[PDB]
């Protein structure tokens, strides 16, 4: 409460339990590499509280999404909304399977 900040950014996203421990400056994993990477010299703080009442229901819910397939790592504080099938081998294949 005793410091004056030039700007504050609030990035929010639902994520699984272990990837909460994944979220930290200088880390590794499918989320810290392809979905969200924090800067190594991060000046900020993280918040995580459980929510089983708004992200759950009978018969289930599958609205949420995450990426494990990207051409390269995510440089810090970049968003990569794109649906491109990851190439395997040498095929220009565009589809699932």
């Amino acid at each position: 409460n005793d410091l004056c900040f030039t700007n504050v950014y609030a990035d929010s996203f639902v994520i699984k339990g272990n990837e909460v421990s994944q979220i930290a400056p200088g880390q590794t994993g499918n989320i810290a590499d392809y979905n969200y990477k924090l800067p190594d010299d991060f000046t900020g703080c993280v918040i995580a509280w459980n929510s089983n009442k708004l992200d759950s229901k009978h018969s289930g819910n599958y609205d949420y999404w995450y990426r494990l397939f990207r051409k390269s790592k995510l440089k810090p504080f970049e968003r990569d909304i794109s649906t491109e099938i990851y190439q395997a081998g040498n095929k220009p294949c565009k589809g699932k399977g």
Binding site: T28, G29, N30, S72, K73, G89
Partner: protein, 48 residues
């Protein structure tokens, strides 16, 4: 041949294979498994 094995030994007897006289491309290593922990100490995995 190290990633395509079927009998990865138990931790009490850690199988130790030696890799010599070959060209190391780790793209096959990336492709051949949906990694869970690529955490590396001695080298940066991108610069491998």
């Amino acid at each position: 041949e190290v990633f395509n094995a079927t009998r990865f030994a138990s931790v009490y007897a850690w199988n130790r294979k030696r890799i010599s006289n070959c060209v190391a491309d780790y793209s096959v290593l990336y492709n051949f498994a949906p990694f869970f922990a690529f955490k590396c100490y001695g080298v940066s995995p991108t610069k491998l």
